């Protein structure tokens, strides 16, 4: 099967609203341009990341998207490494508030579709994209 | 946050009643028992299993129920390794029609709760799960 997705769901103890708004702001690097839709307001960016994972140095080029209604932020990945194994890779990540009305669940989802049967899934990404909101998640607090 | 959820989901070209009875029905071994509901008819096992992950020998106690009418299994690990990490690891196996209605979509999920912020979250039995059914997905065939 060539197509799937990859999900990684955390609790966090923090409003939605402002943890999407913290997230949506933020060996790496990027160079890049920002995106309006036509007040001149930022709606997105654009950028080509110099990154290295598991030791080995990759570049992308993303194009990010948010939805403030919906606390979705969109990465869509065109060109780079990764598209060596995938025709697709999208990453999105969603905060939304615990049912139990408090805190909050984030979800952070890559969305692929492999090349060949001989592809990896992108658990390497999986793991990358967790541990970074787990560090980011450690650096806040009431 | 000690509390998540990891998810793989593969699309398989199979119908989907089909392919949950294929998966209910099936180093490593295990011995158990099989659990009825009252009728006589088999309702679950419990099985303790002894298993290699990247290396290392294991075992664990699972329980597994199922319901047909949503084409779900689920695995309530008790004891074992990985309650040395975790207080909760649950394993729910769902498949659905595509909403193209002709394939399916397999979900593999695992809940999870840490013992501690050091545990790791289970990467590792999300790929062990992932391959498994990828492999088995690779033996059937129209
Ligand atoms: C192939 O997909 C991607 C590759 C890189 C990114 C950029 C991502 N954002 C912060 C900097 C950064 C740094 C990284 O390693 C140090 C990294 O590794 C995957 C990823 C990222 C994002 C991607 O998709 C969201
Ligand atoms: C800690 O959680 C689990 C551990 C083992 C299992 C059993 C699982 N089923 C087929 C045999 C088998 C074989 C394995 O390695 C050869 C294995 O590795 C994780 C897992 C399994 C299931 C588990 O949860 C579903």
Redesign the interface.
């Known amino acids: 099967?060539?197509?799937?997705?990859?999900?990684?769901?955390?609790?966090?103890?923090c409003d939605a609203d402002i943890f999407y708004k913290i997230v949506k702001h933020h060996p790496h690097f990027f160079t890049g341009v920002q995106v309006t839709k036509g007040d001149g307001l930022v709606s997105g960016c654009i950028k080509e990341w110099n990154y290295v994972l598991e030791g080995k140095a990759m570049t992308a080029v993303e194009e990010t998207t948010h939805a403030d209604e919906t606390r979705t932020l969109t990465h869509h990945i065109t060109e780079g490494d990764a598209m060596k194994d995938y025709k697709k890779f999208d990453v999105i990540v969603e905060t939304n508030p615990k049912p139990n009305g408090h805190g909050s669940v984030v979800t952070y989802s890559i969305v692929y579709e492999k090349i060949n049967?001989d592809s990896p899934?992108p658990?390497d990404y999986?793991?990358f994209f967790?541990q970074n909101i787990?560090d980011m998640?450690?650096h806040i607090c009431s």
């Open positions: 099967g060539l197509v799937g997705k990859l999900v990684t769901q955390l609790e966090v103890n049967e899934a658990f999986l793991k967790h787990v998640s450690a």
